[PDB]
Design a protein around this nucleic acid. Structure first.
Lengths: 71, 175, 258
RNA sequence: CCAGAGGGCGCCCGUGAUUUUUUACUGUGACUAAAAAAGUGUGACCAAAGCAGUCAUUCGACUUGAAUUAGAAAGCAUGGGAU
RNA sequence: CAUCCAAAAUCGAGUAACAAUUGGAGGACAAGUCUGGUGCCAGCACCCGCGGUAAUUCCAGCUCCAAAAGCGUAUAUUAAUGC
RNA sequence: GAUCUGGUUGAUUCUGCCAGUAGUCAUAUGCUUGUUUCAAGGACUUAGCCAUGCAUGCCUCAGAAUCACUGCAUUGCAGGAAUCUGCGCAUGGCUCAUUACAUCAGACGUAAUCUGCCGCAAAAAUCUUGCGGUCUCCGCAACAUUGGAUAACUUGGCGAAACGCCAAGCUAAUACAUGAACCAACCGGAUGUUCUCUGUUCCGGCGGCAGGGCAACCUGCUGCCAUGGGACGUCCAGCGAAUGAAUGAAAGUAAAACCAAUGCCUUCACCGGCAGUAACACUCAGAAGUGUUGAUUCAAUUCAUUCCGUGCGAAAGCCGGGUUUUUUUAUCCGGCGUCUUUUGACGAACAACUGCCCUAUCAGCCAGCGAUGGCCGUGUAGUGGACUGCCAUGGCGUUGACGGGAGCGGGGGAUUAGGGUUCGAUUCCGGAGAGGGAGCCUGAGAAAUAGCUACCACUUCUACGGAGGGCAGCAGGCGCGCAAAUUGCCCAAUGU
């Protein structure tokens, strides 16, 4: 997912975007999950950069992810 | 009763959850135990694991450890100097993990003098050893600053480690 | 806690019917999982036919006339999964359950000294207290003091006459290996390759005799022997080779003309 | 119970990339409850049905049968490299 | 349910009274050039339309038609719908 | 079967709906039926109210019998009440009210946790018992020889009734409370004012004595110890849990002393020299130099302090097979039962990837009192704004947030040539509920409702002092609506 915003302290906001398919119209649609993540103080990626994120134990109310790497 | 749940709370969208389910006994808060100073009193509670956990009230003794030399001895908890969480806590001398505290310091003194067959062991241990200055001044007087590194509110035992130079120098300056 | 099971929600590898009854037995927990096991009562009644009714199975088992692992059982419900030797000494017969080709429980009949042999796949190894190493198996058996060469997912030949472990067999290289679950059940072949995907299931590619390769999960590998001429235990009715749909139908007809 | 020679696979780790590289799509393969549906066998007298039964001819045989396919997205592996 | 009316010995149809009904016959839609009664009344008619004394549609009888141990009626829903 | 037939006009060709037409485990309703085979069945209208009866209890060979209970027996045996004890009753069954980032389905994780019964297994801490003398002290002996109550029962009873209750006297255990020396392996550390080898020297320390002293200190003399191992004495040592510390390898070439310790080779030497080399200054010349994982602060090991009842009995347990006559015996064996520890299974509890009807005449929503995040704690079996305190100002939205309406979700049903259209209250799976709400105990598991406590709406008894009831369990009754069965028989089958 990319970087939607860099706002918050040690927490970033990632936006995944994918394609859902509808059978009747035989045509795709764009749908995005805006998600929150805890960005390690090692990294600090700029808006528009792409991030990789893993599966960790809960860390806040919304945050479940962590930043492994940055592109 | 008391519960731990996201289902009485607002969502990220600012909306409200709607219920369909009466609260479980699986989710279950209980009231906080208050560990202070004074005579030891321990009231168990039964827990979900089929075992008991112990509510420390009023612990005035702890099992304290000196870093670097891999030792420990019991001693008496006298005062609480400091805490991160609140000032209010400190004044009532509540004991909860990561409170800086004050201890009798007597057994540590005793130990360190022991740190004909005996006699040459001492000289070997004196060699290749040193101690921080801010430590030794306090240890001379017979008071010390330590931290309580076990949670006493769910074990009813208060164990702590003794501050060493890097960290000691910080907590000192906060006073 | 579940204490009831319905015939449909129960496996049909136990070969129950839609009609007749409403419930099926839920066995007591033991070596094997709910789906992969077959309960005592099912075997005795519906297959062997030493019982015509539920109550008759209690009559035989509670009394005791039946052993599994060479131990006598007074248990009415107990699991019987895979590589278990069951012996009724009254008949004098020794069955070894296995996975037959086409997803069926095999009941295969063995020489008496083979029924003291058993094979258990290892799941974890770990050191326990006193530095005493332990291999924990897929049947929940604890092998104290396993060989220092033991690894996860290897087989340990296990004497039931007196409990110990002789030489192991590894999952390394091409070796004769058979599948458990995944609907390639009872199919036997060499390991051609072992793929790795870390953090996910590790695919393995097997090649059975007379070619026709295929893929199954590492988890579903269970070793048999070093080689097909070094096997320690018997094969079920079919050798571990499947055939095409057309050939099934053809042969069914050919025999029906007798 | 081979000095030397380049080595040849397997295993693990370290280092190196001028900018590694992906995805849709497709073929093949994994992984996926039963009931229900499609379907194979079978004269429950036929039939909706069922998973049964059938044969010698006795103090059992058939290695008895109870096949197999589909089952939206999404996730999995691996070919292909046009759009 | 099945098997039987003796194996020595056990029942029974001829109007085969052991007797099939529910909706239709102007058009759409399979079946009346009918006969009596009613006469814009009574009523029928999903819709188009019938009835003002000359009714293929009403109210009766006969005749014939469709389905059949099932057949009409109401409402919803799907097909009919490329409305 | 991939179907176009009537109806606008004087007549005609269109557009266009209406009507005709065939299905429906889809319901009602009219009329009519001689048999068989197979079945839905008070979901729809009120998750409205309920008369009456019934719906989870259970013991063998193996936990407790002195029924003043019954037979056989004649101080011996077998049945055996209801009572204590253990286990289960949270599952099945029934009902769809809430409900749209909920719930559920496919796939996935729990290195973030609990787990009775079942399976394979593990177990070396423990100063006790008896007798004699005797001070509460010793000496011997060693299937360990342990202690105290409570029900049924008996006696007195109480009350209008009550699945309401009282006093006294009894007496059991696999209930409860105590407690096991010897048996006893292996593994270390702390050591001692114990003596035995020792370092053929002085750079240091300690003790004693004398002299001077500003009492800080200096000088002289004597004794002991200095990189060492034996012998003997003492204290701590197990499993589980808490804290600190160490461990839980490594993979960036081969010159040849320069410094101390020390081994081997070598001579005679404390000279020379580096051929040999897991470890190895003891009783072991191999008795772990090496846990599993993609990944671990995890497994496990070591050392230092701990645990105080809220952890750890060989059930101080029961029943059999014999041998072997003397049975009644430390002669042996078998089957059950239980404590704690350990981890597979059966489940419990969380989290997330993807998907889901209508509505904008619902467009902004969220933070005093947590909204989004960071920091430290608290709590929970556990992760977490789950919660306190402090700090930061974020989070979501036309790719439809938020609000409202309709609806338990899915597998699946009906209909369709295909694409689709529509249904799902209901047999299987998942969730939720038991008049409406909340709180709680017990248990491995419950926020249980044929368990408890309270309130509210109802509702039943009472000589009115009080005491109860919860059918959306099966029949059945009342009410309701267009609409739906017997107060039947059985545990033979299928399960628990």
């Amino acid at each position: 997912g990319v970087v939607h915003s860099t706002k918050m302290k040690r927490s970033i906001v990632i936006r995944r975007d994918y394609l859902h398919f509808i059978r009747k119209y035989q045509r795709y649609q764009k749908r995005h999950r805006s998600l929150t993540v805890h960005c390690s103080p090692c990294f600090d990626p700029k808006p528009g950069d792409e991030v990789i994120v893993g599966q960790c134990r809960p860390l806040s109310k919304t945050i479940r992810y962590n930043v492994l790497e940055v592109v | 009763g008391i519960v731990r749940s996201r289902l009485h709370k607002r969502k990220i969208t600012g909306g409200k959850t709607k219920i369909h389910r009466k609260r479980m006994k699986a989710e279950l808060g209980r009231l906080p135990a208050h560990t202070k100073l004074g005579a030891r009193r321990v009231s168990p509670v039964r827990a979900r694991g089929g075992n008991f956990k112990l509510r420390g009230l009023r612990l005035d003794t702890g099992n304290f450890a000196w870093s670097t030399e891999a030792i420990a001895q019991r001693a008496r908890i006298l005062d609480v100097v400091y805490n991160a969480t609140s000032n209010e806590l400190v004044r009532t001398k509540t004991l909860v993990k990561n409170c800086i505290v004050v201890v009798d310091a007597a057994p540590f003194k005793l130990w360190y003098a022991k740190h004909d067959e005996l006699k040459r062991k001492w000289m070997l241990r004196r060699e290749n050893h040193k101690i921080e200055k801010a430590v030794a001044d306090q240890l001379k007087e017979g008071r010390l600053l330590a931290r309580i590194t076990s949670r006493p509110g769910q074990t009813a035992r208060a164990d702590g480690a003794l501050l060493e130079g890097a960290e000691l120098q910080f907590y000192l300056k906060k006073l | 806690t579940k204490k009831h099971l319905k015939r449909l929600y129960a496996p049909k590898d136990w070969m129950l019917s839609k009609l007749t009854g409403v419930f099926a037995p839920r066995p007591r927990a033991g070596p094997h999982k709910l789906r992969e096991c077959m309960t005592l009562m099912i075997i005795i009644r519906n297959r062997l036919k030493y019982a015509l009714n539920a109550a008759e199975a209690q009559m035989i088992l509670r009394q005791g006339l039946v052993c599994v692992d060479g131990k006598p059982r007074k248990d009415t419900k107990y699991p019987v999964g895979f590589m278990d030797v069951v012996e009724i000494p009254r008949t004098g017969d020794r069955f070894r359950i296995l996975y037959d080709v086409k997803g069926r429980f095999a009941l295969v009949k063995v020489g008496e000294a083979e029924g003291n042999i058993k094979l258990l796949k290892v799941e974890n190894v770990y050191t326990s207290t006193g530095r005493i190493p332990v291999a924990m198996t897929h049947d929940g058996h604890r092998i104290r003091y396993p060989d220092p060469r033991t690894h996860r997912g290897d087989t340990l030949v296990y004497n039931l006459k007196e409990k110990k472990v002789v030489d192991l067999i590894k999952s390394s290289n091409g070796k004769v290996v058979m599948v458990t679950g995944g609907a390639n059940r009872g199919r036997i072949g060499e390991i051609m390759s072992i793929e790795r995907h870390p953090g996910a299931f590790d695919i393995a590619r097997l090649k059975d005799a007379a070619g026709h390769e295929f893929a199954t999960r590492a988890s579903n590998i269970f070793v048999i022997g070093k080689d097909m001429q070094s096997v320690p235990v018997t094969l079920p009715k079919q050798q571990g080779l499947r055939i095409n749909v057309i050939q099934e139908r053809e042969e069914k007809l050919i025999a029906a003309e007798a």
